[PDB]
Amino acid sequence: AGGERIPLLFTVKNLVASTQPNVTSITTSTDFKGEFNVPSYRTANFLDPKGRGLASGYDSAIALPQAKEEELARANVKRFSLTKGQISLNVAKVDGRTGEIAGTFESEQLSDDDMGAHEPHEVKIQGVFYASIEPA
Amino acid sequence: MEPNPNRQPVELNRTSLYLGLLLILVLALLFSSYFFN
Amino acid sequence: MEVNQLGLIATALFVLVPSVFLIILYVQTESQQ
Amino acid sequence: PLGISGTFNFMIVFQAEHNILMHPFHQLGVAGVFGGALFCAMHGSLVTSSLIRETTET
Amino acid sequence: DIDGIREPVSGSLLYGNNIITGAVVPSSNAIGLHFYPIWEAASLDEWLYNGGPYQLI
Amino acid sequence: GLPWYRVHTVLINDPGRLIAAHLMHTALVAGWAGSMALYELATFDPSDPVLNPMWRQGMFVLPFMARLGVTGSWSGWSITGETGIDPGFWSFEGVALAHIVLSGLLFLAACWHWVYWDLELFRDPRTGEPALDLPKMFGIHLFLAGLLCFGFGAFHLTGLFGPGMWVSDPYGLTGSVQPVAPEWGPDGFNPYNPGGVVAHHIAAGIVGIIAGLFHILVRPPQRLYKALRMGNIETVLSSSIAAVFFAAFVVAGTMWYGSATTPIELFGPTRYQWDSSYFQQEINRRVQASLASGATLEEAWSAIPEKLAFYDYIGNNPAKGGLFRTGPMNKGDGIAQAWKGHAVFRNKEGEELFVRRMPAFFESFPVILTDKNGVVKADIPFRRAESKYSFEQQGVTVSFYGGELNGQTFTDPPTVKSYARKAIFGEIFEFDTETLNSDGIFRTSPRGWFTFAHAVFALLFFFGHIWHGARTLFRDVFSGIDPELSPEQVEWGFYQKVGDVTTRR
Amino acid sequence: GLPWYRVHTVLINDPGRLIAAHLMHTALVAGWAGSMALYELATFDPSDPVLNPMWRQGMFVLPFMARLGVTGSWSGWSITGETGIDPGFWSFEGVALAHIVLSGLLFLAACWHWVYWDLELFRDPRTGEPALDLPKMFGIHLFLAGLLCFGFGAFHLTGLFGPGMWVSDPYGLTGSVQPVAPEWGPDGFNPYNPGGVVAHHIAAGIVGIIAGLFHILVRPPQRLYKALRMGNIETVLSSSIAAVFFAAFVVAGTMWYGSATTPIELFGPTRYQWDSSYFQQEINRRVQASLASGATLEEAWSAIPEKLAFYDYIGNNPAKGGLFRTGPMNKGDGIAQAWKGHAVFRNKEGEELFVRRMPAFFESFPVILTDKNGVVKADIPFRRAESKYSFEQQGVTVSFYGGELNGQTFTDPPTVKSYARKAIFGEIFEFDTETLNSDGIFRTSPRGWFTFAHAVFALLFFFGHIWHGARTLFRDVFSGIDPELSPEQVEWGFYQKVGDVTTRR
Amino acid sequence: ARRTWLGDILRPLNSEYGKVAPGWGTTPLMAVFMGLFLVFLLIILEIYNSTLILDGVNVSWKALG
Ligand code: CLA
Ligand code: CLA
Ligand code: CLA
Ligand code: CLA
Ligand code: CLA
Ligand code: CLA
Ligand code: CLA
Ligand code: CLA
Ligand SMILES: CC1=C(/C=C/C(C)=C/C=C/C(C)=C/C=C/C=C(C)/C=C/C=C(C)/C=C/C2=C(C)CCCC2(C)C)C(C)(C)CCC1
Ligand SMILES: CC1=C(/C=C/C(C)=C/C=C/C(C)=C/C=C/C=C(C)/C=C/C=C(C)/C=C/C2=C(C)CCCC2(C)C)C(C)(C)CCC1
Ligand SMILES: CCCCCCCCCCCCCCCCCC(=O)O
């Protein structure tokens, strides 16, 4: 509300999620909880609108040749965040024949910080998930 | 439809011009200090 | 001095608008006679 | 784009991806508008130059 | 320095006055009722500091 | 030719172009409304209705839209702080848009009536002369006024078919738009009872319908027609101006004193709430109550809502402004960020001391600390040499309960004095002065600006009333007195009755 | 009536009111020059002729007063840095006062000639018609112009009776007002020889005096009088505009390229000094000499004057600005406070590297360091993934000699990189950006602004010449061609010579 | 003058210019309503002024509850 757009990398990268102990079978009360990595929303080659970047681009504000650089350092110096998110998966449906499960999830993670330019927001995501389990 | 009969010429003589310009310039001289504050 | 920056436009329009009005009326009075 | 700077953006990207300046149809367009401006000024000037005296200098 | 106490009062537009606050400031109390024409001053610099123009005007 | 001050009299005998002009005026006023709202939307910060409400931000028409039920933006915010709402089409933006479309349509109708001025409707069927039956027009328009007035009260304000209006508790903490039911009893005349506003519009609406019907069917008595020159449109302008300046004085007073229709969450507190310590009483009431039931000092004061504390602070007093101190109140003391807490002062003997609060009359006020009995025990002295009561001599300390400095105590005299200089303004806040480059000088609120303009316009329209009233009653001598007025008529004794030639002696 | 673009033609046959019009224009111009000078005094900072000279401050008329010998203010400063000086009346303030007074007297002269327009002098004795004998006036005015031209050179520029003019050394370090002897040899024609300016005025003045005498005494031949329409004052307008735009192109030229009359201490450097590294060469000469005499690097670089380094900086290049980048150069890069020192870059192998300098064409420019052979040895890369020459990879350091940083060495890549980005602008200076709220973007100098305005004005005046030249030669058909023009004159084959009826068949 | 459809409809509403009732007409009845309205504004004024004080009528912000 108000028109602020919040980008985020909705992700479960490197997810590791575990159940409670002694689980002889997956049931409609089974819960996984885990955490994942949230890499930076833009990656290292991303150039900003004045041509500045991490792995490429200008390293300064070339349009203001003789400005004091110290005021612009946070914008001139791109930084690549890596952060953690947490996720719950609640199994609410099991087809014990096929090995299909289904349920809801909730995750919490951070939003885009625009390569260190501003502070990210906290995001909570909710939804549904489906998975099929096969003997490996 | 006939043209409108209620129309009239309007006038401002030279002396009223001088009077009004004096009014506006002195009023500006007085309030300008307050606008700049 | 740290004066209000709109004071200048305030003052300029305050002078210009009513002055122009009077001049318009005077000149068209003269081209009548 | 529906803009002034966006127009130029469109013009520049075009030249890079199509070499529009080396395209004869665009060269014909430049002849079209240059020459149209020419003949515009030519015709105006020539008719203006041969106006029949019907007025005074004031 | 209207009051002769070496505390100069600013009166003119270019020294931070507007129409309402500006003033030609009276001559120094140190002069009292003495006549202070320009030619009685060592310099215009002195005459200005001591309020010379008020008397002339 | 006509003098410049009479150009608009060419409309006196031209009903069609008179309507054209009135349309153009109405187009302009509606256009303004739409422009003013758009400018305010583009400058309004909706993110904190507690410490940065609309009335701190120089908002003028926003509160009038909110007063009658428009409270949200298409952008998703509401002025009550609720978020993720969907106002429908009647958002601030949609209201602004409607007034602009209305402006454009009025403009076009004005063109049509200006060109096609010579409508047979305006001609008197007997004499072929333009003429307006002003007595019957009054009845038609009055009947219409009464329908609208009644419907406004019966449907909009009740919620029967409409949103209601803004109502709040006595301390302006929990306001919102609610339907309001009529108050038919004598408390309906209480300016602070919102139910009376509803009953007024219903009953007055019905009287207006009845009066309207009377004035459509019953012709004016000949005596009255003659007395008030009811064939002269300028008599209507004279009485209309008088009613307008009457209405203008009333709305200025109720804005200044407060009434159910000028709530403090839309317009700011009144000065009388500062004079009478209205919010300070209530705040103390709650701290006492929290203490009686055994809460600690820190607990009692931390329970004080910031919104209430922010009313108990002279920077929101509308009588602390200046004529040429322009803009939002935020431009002066700053954008309030947080309540710092309640300052308690004590001298070296543990006695609690009370800062004497600044009265609205005073641009500047000395810092004087009294005990509960009103005896002076500390101050900040001007002349230091014979100082009896300095903070340094009396060991004055300041401790904070609630707010951002809760549980902090200060003892270094310069710091303690610094808070005591703020305690004269009431409760102490942290302000952001950088963002707006605030200059530190108190400005008035919309309650103040509205009252000033309307009291001034009223007084000026009284002169309009006198001028046009005079012109109506003395029409025959406007251009000058009779060049054949005979001296026996103005000299004493000739006539028994002054001016009456039939009373000769 | 008259079209708006012809209102001023009422003066063509009215020599008195023409003089009045011209007096009024003259008053406006003197008024402008006095106004402009007062504004520049009110805003000029005299405290630093080294790093904050007039041309850094957007001073436009101050250098033209300086140029001809006005160098001091009534407040006791001079532009050469000398304090405690009595300029007499002819200070910057006295010259301004004079132009204001002169403007006011010309104003009154204009009212007199406007009102008393019908003077018998302006009427031809033969025919009683308004007539001006333009051949005679030209001779009179030429003779006067010659007297003034001669005297200006003979007395003011030589110092015989007058102050001389601004002269300086070839690197703009030691300028001042000095009498100047005439150079009568062929080097007089060298635009950089000041003695030629003197000689020019003496000889040219003499020639003007003789030519003026010839033009008072010898009537023009009938042939030229007819061909050039010398009874028509618009012919003078046409030729005058031409001589004006001719003159305007020359002053634009000599201002852009430099001459003895456009010194760099008054107007700033030229762009061609940046292009040829004129100042960088000289700084280097001096350094190579000091090391020869056996001073250290610190000692040799510490002997370079700040003034001379400040010239070796592209921020003072007049070709680095923008058309709507407004104000003084201090508003861009800031107010120069000090020379930081000459920056010397080395790689890890101890070899010295040289930042390639920004050419004036380039708004932005990459940082490339080469060795003495111009082999690329270090850069700041765009894409880093395959960089070979990054400062981190090459161990690039910076060490400073002279200036404020003398004897310091920085090794961390970020610091070395910021000084390398300034090294493209030439010598590195400490700037004050706070005072003027400078934005960091290069502006042009009064040399650039003068050149732009006069080259534009010259070009437009060309069109004025063509316009009034055509109106002179074609006056007979200015209102249209002859309504009864036979086709035989305009069609082919009738007349053996075009437009000559005597050559029929 | 120009006739229009809407004009002809509205016509009788602007057709009695000058018509009066004879003599004083309803002037006495008007005077009564004026008197009642003065008293009524008096009360309203003196309530706001706290010069008329009425049971269960609390002229204060605390009448919002
Ligand atoms: C059950 C029926 C009912 C009820 C509950 C109400 C309720 C109300 N009426 Mg309504 N009314 C009704 C029927 C009803 N009315 C009917 C039938 C009519 C006749 C059509 C009206 C006509 C009417 C009018 C004309 C007014 C009200 C007003 C009011 C409000 C009074 C509170 C207030 O703030 O007064 C505040 C107003 C006053 C105390 C009046 C002050 C009069 C001033 C002092 C006169 C002098 C002015 C003078 C020119 C200035 C001189 C100089 C000065 C600066 C010193 C309240 C909402 C008042 C209002 O709208 O207030 C906003 C009001 O003015 N009523
Ligand atoms: C009833 C009218 C009214 C009222 C009460 C307000 C009230 C307010 N407006 Mg709004 N406004 C209005 C009409 C109104 N406005 C109109 C018509 C416009 C369009 C021009 C605007 C445009 C507007 C903008 C653009 C802004 C406001 C803002 C504000 C706030 C600050 C106002 C301020 O600083 O005034 C100070 C006012 C003065 C100093 C005016 C003094 C009047 C002069 C001195 C009178 C001249 C004397 C005259 C010549 C007499 C001599 C005659 C004699 C010789 C015969 C405040 C809430 C501001 C705000 O905070 O918005 C968020 C803001 O930025 N208003
Ligand atoms: C509804 C209100 C209203 C209406 C319709 C009229 C209508 C009229 N007035 Mg009245 N008048 C009014 C209110 C009103 N007046 C008030 C409040 C006053 C006291 C200030 C007067 C004082 C007054 C005088 C003294 C005279 C009139 C005259 C006239 C007539 C000619 C006006 C003219 O050509 O002005 C032309 C005016 C101008 C061309 C420019 C005036 C510019 C002013 C100074 C400032 C601009 C204000 C701004 C644009 C917008 C208004 C802001 C705010 C009010 C909303 C006309 C019938 C004249 C008359 O009787 O002639 C027979 C006359 O001499 N009026
Ligand atoms: C011993 C005697 C003597 C001496 C030493 C000088 C010395 C000088 N004369 Mg003077 N001169 C003398 C006698 C003398 N004069 C006499 C007797 C006369 C006759 C009255 C003149 C008439 C005269 C004129 C008319 C001019 C000089 C100029 C000069 C200066 C030449 C250096 C320069 O900057 O040229 C720079 C000027 C030129 C190189 C000539 C410009 C020619 C251009 C190309 C003309 C074409 C422009 C065209 C209209 C538009 C351009 C097209 C496109 C590129 C835009 C120098 C100070 C020149 C001057 O004052 O310049 C500052 C100058 O213009 N002299
Ligand atoms: C009465 C004498 C007088 C004096 C001593 C001055 C003195 C000065 N003026 Mg002022 N001025 C005067 C009258 C005077 N002015 C008048 C009447 C006006 C109004 C028109 C001005 C308008 C004016 C302006 C607008 C400016 C000055 C400026 C200046 C200063 C620099 C002058 C300069 O560079 O000239 C340079 C002049 C020339 C290069 C002109 C050369 C003549 C050309 C080549 C024409 C040649 C054509 C000729 C007919 C052919 C001759 C043929 C030959 C063979 C003889 C100086 C302090 C400047 C300043 O700093 O002001 C603060 C400035 O910007 N003055
Ligand atoms: C500022 C100097 C000056 C000026 C303006 C004049 C002006 C005049 N002279 Mg005088 N004269 C002068 C100096 C001057 N003279 C001097 C020093 C002498 C020597 C004593 C004379 C001797 C003299 C004689 C003997 C006569 C005149 C005559 C005339 C008149 C007619 C000129 C004519 O027909 O031009 C014709 C020229 C044109 C119509 C236009 C020419 C335009 C040129 C060619 C354009 C060049 C453009 C080109 C691209 C730029 C050059 C490029 C670069 C490389 C050089 C005129 C009033 C005649 C007259 O009537 O006397 C009363 C005459 O008989 N003059
Ligand atoms: C020969 C003319 C001339 C020149 C070269 C200068 C040069 C300078 N002035 Mg001075 N100035 C002049 C005349 C001149 N001035 C006049 C006449 C005035 C009185 C108004 C002033 C008043 C003045 C002030 C008040 C100041 C300067 C300052 C300065 C400096 C910076 C100027 C700047 O930022 O430009 C900016 C220039 C532009 C943005 C150019 C605008 C041109 C546009 C494109 C308009 C033309 C469009 C046109 C309408 C097209 C229509 C075509 C149609 C036929 C279709 C510079 C040294 C400044 C300074 O540093 O002071 C110390 C400063 O503060 N000047
Ligand atoms: C010495 C210079 C000079 C002089 C004295 C004249 C004189 C004249 N011109 Mg010529 N002219 C000149 C230069 C000059 N011109 C130049 C340089 C050009 C090319 C741009 C022209 C192009 C030109 C045309 C096309 C025409 C004239 C016409 C005329 C006549 C009528 C002018 C009029 O009523 O304007 C009235 C003008 C106005 C009321 C307002 C104009 C506003 C302008 C556009 C902007 C104002 C500029 C501003 C004040 C600052 C000036 C800066 C200055 C340093 C340049 C008059 C004889 C007219 C003519 O032939 O009549 C028969 C005509 O049609 N002139
Ligand atoms: C046509 C059309 C349209 C359009 C419209 C428009 C767009 C509108 C706009 C409008 C507007 C946009 C308007 C506005 C207006 C404004 C105004 C009207 C204002 C006023 C003001 C004033 C009057 C002020 C005054 C003052 C001052 C200045 C100072 C202070 C005081 C005072 C307040 C007095 C549309 C599309 C819709 C539709 C179709 C048609
Ligand atoms: C009477 C008198 C007097 C007085 C005088 C005076 C005080 C005057 C002043 C004067 C002055 C004070 C003047 C001024 C003027 C100015 C001017 C003349 C200006 C001009 C401008 C312009 C023309 C511009 C243009 C432009 C623009 C605007 C923009 C950009 C472009 C341009 C540059 C083009 C005296 C006492 C002395 C003496 C006795 C008598
Ligand atoms: C006042 C202390 C310094 C001495 C002043 C010297 C005398 C005055 C000199 C003024 C210089 C102007 C001479 C140039 C004017 C040319 C003559 C003219 O064209 O009107």
From Swiss-Prot, chain A:
Co-factor note (free text): PSII binds multiple chlorophylls, carotenoids and specific lipids.
Q: Where in the cell is it found?
A: Cellular thylakoid membrane
Molecular function terms, GO-annotated: oxygen evolving activity
Q: Which GO terms describe its cellular component?
A: photosystem II oxygen evolving complex; plasma membrane-derived thylakoid membrane
What membrane topology term does the record carry? Peripheral membrane protein
Q: Which domain of life is it from?
A: Bacteria
GO biological processes: photosystem II assembly; photosystem II stabilization
List the keywords (alphabetical): Membrane, Photosynthesis, Photosystem II, Signal, Thylakoid
How is the quaternary structure described? PSII is composed of 1 copy each of membrane proteins PsbA, PsbB, PsbC, PsbD, PsbE, PsbF, PsbH, PsbI, PsbJ, PsbK, PsbL, PsbM, PsbT, PsbX, PsbY, PsbZ, Psb30/Ycf12, peripheral proteins PsbO, CyanoQ (PsbQ), PsbU, PsbV and a large number of cofactors. It forms dimeric complexes.
Function text: One of the extrinsic, lumenal subunits of photosystem II (PSII), which stabilize and protect the oxygen-evolving complex. PSII is a light-driven water plastoquinone oxidoreductase, using light energy to abstract electrons from H(2)O, generating a proton gradient subsequently used for ATP formation. Required for dimerization of PSII and for binding of PsbQ to PSII.
Q: Which family does it belong to?
A: Belongs to the PsbO family.
Q: What is this protein called?
A: Photosystem II extrinsic protein O
Source organism per entry reads Thermosynechococcus vestitus (strain NIES-2133 / IAM M-273 / BP-1)
Gene name for this UniProt entry? psbO
Portion held of the full protein: 137 to 272 of 272
Curated annotation (Swiss-Prot), chain B:
GO terms for biological process, alphabetical: photosynthesis
Q: Which residues lie on this side of the membrane: Cytoplasmic?
A: 1-13
Q: Which UniProt keywords apply?
A: Membrane, Photosynthesis, Photosystem II, Reaction center, Thylakoid, Transmembrane, Transmembrane helix
- Output the superkingdom of the source species: Bacteria
* Lumenal side of membrane: 36-37
Q: How does it sit in the membrane?
A: Single-pass membrane protein
Cofactor note from UniProt? PSII binds multiple chlorophylls, carotenoids and specific lipids.
Q: How would you summarize the oligomeric state and partners of this protein? A: PSII is composed of 1 copy each of membrane proteins PsbA, PsbB, PsbC, PsbD, PsbE, PsbF, PsbH, PsbI, PsbJ, PsbK, PsbL, PsbM, PsbT, PsbX, PsbY, PsbZ, Psb30/Ycf12, peripheral proteins PsbO, CyanoQ (PsbQ), PsbU, PsbV and a large number of cofactors. It forms dimeric complexes. Part of a photosystem II (PSII) assembly intermediate complex PSII-I; crystallized from a strain deleted of psbJ, it forms monomeric PSII before addition of the oxygen evolving complex. PSII-I includes 3 assembly factors not found in mature PSII (Psb27, Psb28 and Psb34).
The protein's name is Photosystem II reaction center protein L
The organism's lineage?
Bacteria, Bacillati, Cyanobacteriota, Cyanophyceae, Acaryochloridales
UniProtKB/Swiss-Prot annotation, chain C:
Annotated cofactor note: PSII binds multiple chlorophylls, carotenoids and specific lipids.
Q: Which InterPro entries match?
A: PSII_PsbM, PSII_PsbM_sf
Where it sits in the cell: the answer is: Cellular thylakoid membrane
Locate the transmembrane regions by residue number: 7-28
Q: Which UniProt keywords apply?
A: Formylation, Membrane, Photosynthesis, Photosystem II, Reaction center, Thylakoid, Transmembrane, Transmembrane helix
Parts of the chain on the Cytoplasmic side: 29-33
> Sorted alphabetically, which HAMAP family does this protein's record hold?
PSII_PsbM
Biological role stated in the UniProt entry: One of the components of the core complex of photosystem II (PSII). PSII is a light-driven water:plastoquinone oxidoreductase that uses light energy to abstract electrons from H(2)O, generating O(2) and a proton gradient subsequently used for ATP formation. It consists of a core antenna complex that captures photons, and an electron transfer chain that converts photonic excitation into a charge separation. This subunit is found at the monomer-monomer interface.
Mind telling me what this protein is named? Photosystem II reaction center protein M
Q: What is the lineage of its organism?
A: Bacteria, Bacillati, Cyanobacteriota, Cyanophyceae, Acaryochloridales
UniProtKB/Swiss-Prot annotation, chain H:
Q: Which residues form a coiled coil?
A: none
Main subcellular localisation = membrane
Q: Name one GO molecular function term.
A: phosphate ion binding
Alphabetically list the UniProt keywords.
Membrane, Photosynthesis, Photosystem II, Thylakoid, Transmembrane, Transmembrane helix
GO CC, any one term:
plasma membrane-derived thylakoid membrane
The record's remark on the cofactor is: PSII binds multiple chlorophylls, carotenoids and specific lipids.
The transmembrane segments are: 27-46
Topological domain spans for side Lumenal? 47-65
Write out the annotated subcellular location.
Cellular thylakoid membrane
Its placement in the membrane is given as: Single-pass membrane protein
Q: Which domain of life is it from?
A: Bacteria
Residues on Cytoplasmic side? 1-26
Give the UniProt record's GO annotations in the biological process aspect: photosynthesis; protein stabilization
Q: What happens when the gene is disrupted?
A: Not essential for photoautotrophic growth, however PSII is less stable, a considerable amount is missing the oxygen evolving complex, and it is missing PsbX.
Q: Assembly and interactions?
A: PSII is composed of 1 copy each of membrane proteins PsbA, PsbB, PsbC, PsbD, PsbE, PsbF, PsbH, PsbI, PsbJ, PsbK, PsbL, PsbM, PsbT, PsbX, PsbY, PsbZ, Psb30/Ycf12, peripheral proteins PsbO, CyanoQ (PsbQ), PsbU, PsbV and a large number of cofactors. It forms dimeric complexes. Part of a photosystem II (PSII) assembly intermediate complex PSII-I; crystallized from a strain deleted of psbJ, it forms monomeric PSII before addition of the oxygen evolving complex. PSII-I includes 3 assembly factors not found in mature PSII (Psb27, Psb28 and Psb34).
Q: Which HAMAP family match?
A: PSII_PsbH (MF_00752)
Q: Which family does it belong to?
A: Belongs to the PsbH family.
By what name is this protein known?
A: Photosystem II reaction center protein H
Q: Which organism is it from?
A: Thermosynechococcus vestitus (strain NIES-2133 / IAM M-273 / BP-1)
Name the gene. Answer: psbH
